[PDB]
């Protein structure tokens, strides 16, 4: 049954999470960096090997509601693959994956504790015998195992992409790669130090026995809320002011990017129809167009573009409708994903999917699975990717990767 | 009841034209350009039709799929807009020829120029010379009759709009689905209700 | 809102059905059994689905077209109903034999028997044995699981009814749209507002 | 300008129309058997070789209406040809034709003459010099020149056609024979002889210069008045009553036909589809079911099947949409037609076509054009056939096409 408690005379995430990643063989924390979600179920989880949105639909009638603050009142959390979308479009199946990963793995949590840090209060309805006590974090040392596509194998690929481009067969493509170690720790540690390093508004932790997802993604795919729909295109990067005015120096330096808002447009297009899908006509709007976001890092040029869902849809078609963002794929998108199929050398799995819950109460929120570690069993994979353009630079578009990499492998210990 | 069929040329923009269109009153039927048998088009005998933009050039039968039929066969008696492929196709069925754009506008918005001599239903009410996004690495050119060129682009200078002397079928270079365009729920509500 | 997708078998009869179908309040498109892709059919997306009577066996695949993809992979989360051919493409669909009749019904009234052991929401209201036209020369038989037969030919005693143990698929041997069958339109008034 | 006269100051309609038909190359006959209706044209002629809706939609707009009684008020008299289905349905191209027919001929008149009989009023709008003065009807005179299909080829595509039958191709599928003739002398003869023999509500005589119908129509294959369409479909025949006695045994010979009633609902199911095709849903209704009509020396089992045209039709739709005539034709029609022109040796030109009016007022007319001979340059032809059913006897079929032919062979003047 449950129990609020005063935040302070509580434990703190992590803390209280410690205890229950180790105790359970399915667990997740999600955080917000406004709101801390604790859940474990103690009946198992569900392993998609269909299509997802078929599959999860069953799910959601007995679904049992949780009174508790947040987007989440109790439904089911997990991650849907990236290749996940071959239910929902024609892509070529030609490359090998790089680990064996179901279309998807939720569970519905048997327990759950909320943490309303505006208000200091923690909702606690859980069967919990003690509140922690399991020592401190592990250590977690890796290995380097391999790395898919080298500086000029990628480089390459983004030459045979620009073609492409230059055709007219795309505007723009993301090429990824990765690096796998094999490893030995706590992988909550990877976690610690994605918290501390990146924090971000979508942190997530979610343990499926012999899996692991844990990341903090830096975008949301979208969001439904009394049945409205909601999603964030970004583009164009500039690191925060070292005053209040170096700062605007670079914003407008976003402003007037001929290039990073052309990007961005495409984007919101990409976006405003995908929403378009799923819609009542007349209510796809972009009512925050093109602004500058800052961050704690970065800021981004962002919009706003939201729409009321059909009667007749789901959270689930709303996934459906977005999945695989623009951003992580192209566009047009069903060329994209083909010629990604085409040029990179394994199937993405989790990586450039997305990861989130779908509220008891028919709201949803899935964050883009990027700036990610998978652990599956004895390997642990960091991917990234960097979206090609008619301009772009083989060489540059690398290190693109290899900076988007290195905050990984800094996440996971190597440095 | 109105009804306007969109041939999908597997697009990611196909949806904006289907909402502008479900808005506008008239009942959006989305497919793509190998779902459907052109005389499966005639059956379910749409008012009209648009045909979306997509990659690919029309010059490639898989890129266009049952488009460049449908103009042909069905565009004389039954209206027809045609959007960045779908606009190049409808050129390419009228001995226009496809080319790479001298420059590459890939989401960038263009100042489009009506180079209309006479007046065009498509066209009512819109400024001489407005703003659109563009989409497009390849553009239309040696345009000749049966069809005439309506738009021009400013800075560029390659034809954005044109159409048949005689059937009701229009082809636009940019976007009027497009958050960039904005008299382009506009031009879509001509195409509805003035062709 | 509310859409009939009818695949037309190349039928003299399926307009019986468009015209009950929109006297219903739903919306009726009429496409042939080869005019449209299953891909295609999707993407419409159909409230429901009717696959008219026909020449031929479902045996055969000119004879049917998409009919048989429709059934077996739309059938689950879309009522079908088929006609004549399009019962015998559900019979066959399920494993059941497709054979000629004892009897050869063509535009002869027969008397229908229902034979449903548990209620069915097609049948509401319909009375145990009606009277109802029969076009067809071959017959559905050895019908088994999943498939279950619901009516029967009185004095032929042929299957003249059938469907699915859980998907929402009927198939009736006999004609509702016919002038011959006076329960016909409550048959398809089931159809379209029950299952 | 106009002039209504006295029916009994004028000469009669064949009388008026021995002038007409000699002085021009375009004119027309057409007759009830309660108005008659001569009408010739000073400016030739339209000859179809393409859609014939499409074509003559062009010519609707400027047709002058002409304030007689009747459902024709000026507009255009023609014919459409069999093969003129052609464009509105997929049909194999095997067999050549037995002449040349464009797909259609039709007038518009240039003077028009009316005989409202049921008022002893004839309504003259004529450029007339004199009324008549041109002697009689000359003679007619043929020789045999060929037949297509004797007895035994017709009655093996008879049993071949039974097959298809048999399988489940069709219910019902008409195969014809013909007979052709060379010719000299007055074509009127004809006429004058069917009007004598065969006298119908659907008499008819075309002339299209080198080209004619001369026919008395027994069916009608649709009618459009002030948008509503109405057809009558025809099955079942008994010769009339010795005594008011011998009649009603014949009558419900009829109505105790399960054969004939059975060909018959299948005809209404047929008629009521066509009429589906341009109906507004929910007008599409049989008023008169399965009556018996007596006509002056047969009577046929005979429905009343209506509807309500929609407001985007014309009545070019409607006879796209119901030619050509169930009865001519068979069922299902699509598979039914090609069939006939695998069977046939020929393309059957006018024969099972139709020929009627478009009304100037939207309204119109048209007939199945049967029991007529069509006369092509130095042919004359003579075409018959009959249904085919599941079990049909190859010889009977055959005699039902060589009564049918004996007829005309008689208005021609062979016997």
């Given at each position: 049954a449950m129990e609020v408690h005063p935040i302070s005379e509580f434990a703190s995430p992590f803390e209280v999470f410690k205890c229950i990643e180790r105790d359970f063989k399915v667990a997740g924390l999600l955080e917000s960096i406004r709101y801390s979600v604790i859940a474990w179920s103690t009946n198992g989880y569900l392993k998609i090997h269909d299509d997802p949105v078929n599959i999860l639909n069953g799910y959601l009638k007995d679904l049992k509601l949780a009174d508790i603050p947040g987007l989440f009142k109790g439904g089911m959390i997990g991650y849907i693959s990236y290749d996940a979308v071959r239910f929902w479009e024609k892509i070529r199946d030609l490359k090998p994956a790089a680990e064996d990963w179901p279309y998807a793995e939720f569970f519905t949590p048997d327990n759950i504790i909320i943490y309303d840090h505006n208000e200091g209060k923690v909702y606690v309805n859980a069967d919990l015998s003690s509140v922690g006590g399991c020592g401190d974090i592990g250590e977690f040392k890796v290995s380097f195992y391999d790395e898919s596509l080298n500086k000029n194998s990628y480089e390459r690929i983004v030459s045979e992409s620009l073609e492409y481009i230059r055709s007219g067969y795309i505007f723009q493509v993301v090429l990824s790669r990765f690096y796998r170690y094999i490893f030995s720790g706590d992988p909550l540690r990877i976690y610690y130090n994605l918290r501390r390093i990146n924090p971000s508004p979508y942190m997530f932790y979610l343990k499926f026995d012999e899996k692991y997802l844990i990341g903090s993604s830096p975008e949301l795919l979208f969001r439904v809320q009394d049945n409205i729909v909601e999603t964030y295109p970004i583009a164009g990067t500039r690191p925060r002011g070292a005053d209040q005015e170096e700062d605007l120096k670079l914003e407008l330096e976003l402003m007037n990017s001929e290039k990073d808002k052309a990007e961005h447009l495409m984007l919101v297009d990409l976006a405003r129809n995908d929403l378009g899908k799923v819609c009542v006509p007349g209510t796809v709007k972009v009512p925050e167009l093109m602004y500058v976001e800052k961050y704690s890092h970065v800021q981004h040029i962002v919009s706003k573009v939201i729409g009321t869902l059909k009667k007749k849809y789901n959270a689930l078609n709303v996934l459906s409708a977005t999945f695989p963002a623009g951003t992580v794929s192209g566009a047009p998108k069903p060329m994209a994903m083909n010629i990604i199929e085409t040029l990179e050398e394994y199937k993405r799995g989790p990586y450039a999917g997305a990861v989130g819950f779908i509220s008891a109460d028919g709201n949803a929120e899935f964050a883009i699975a990027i700036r990610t570690a998978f652990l599956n069993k004895e390997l642990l994979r960091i991917h990234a990717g960097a979206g090609i353009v008619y301009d772009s630079n083989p060489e540059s578009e690398y290190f693109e990767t290899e900076h988007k990499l290195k905050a990984l492998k800094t996440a996971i210990g190597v440095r | 009841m109105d009804l306007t069929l969109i041939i999908d040329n597997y697009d990611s923009f196909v949806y904006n034209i289907a909402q502008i269109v479900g808005e506008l009153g008239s009942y959006p039927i989305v497919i793509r350009n190998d779902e459907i048998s052109i005389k499966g088009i005639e059956r379910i005998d749409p008012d009209r039709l648009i045909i979306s933009p997509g990659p690919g050039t029309p010059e490639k039968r898989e890129d266009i799929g049952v488009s460049l039929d449908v103009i042909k066969y069905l565009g004389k008696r039954t209206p027809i807009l045609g959007v960045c492929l779908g606009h190049q196709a409808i050129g390419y069925a009228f001995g226009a020829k496809i080319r790479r754009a001298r420059k590459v506008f890939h989401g960038k918005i263009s100042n489009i120029i009506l180079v209309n001599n006479s007046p065009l239903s498509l066209y009512?009410?819109?400024?001489k010379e407005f703003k659109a996004t563009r989409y497009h690495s390849l553009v239309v050119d040696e345009v000749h009759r049966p069809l005439i060129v309506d738009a021009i682009s400013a800075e560029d200078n390659e034809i954005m709009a044109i159409h048949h002397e005689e059937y009701p079928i229009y082809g636009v270079q940019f976007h009027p689905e497009s958050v960039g365009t904005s008299l382009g729920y506009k031009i879509l509500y001509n195409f509805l209700n003035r062709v």
């Open positions: - | 009512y009410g819109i400024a």
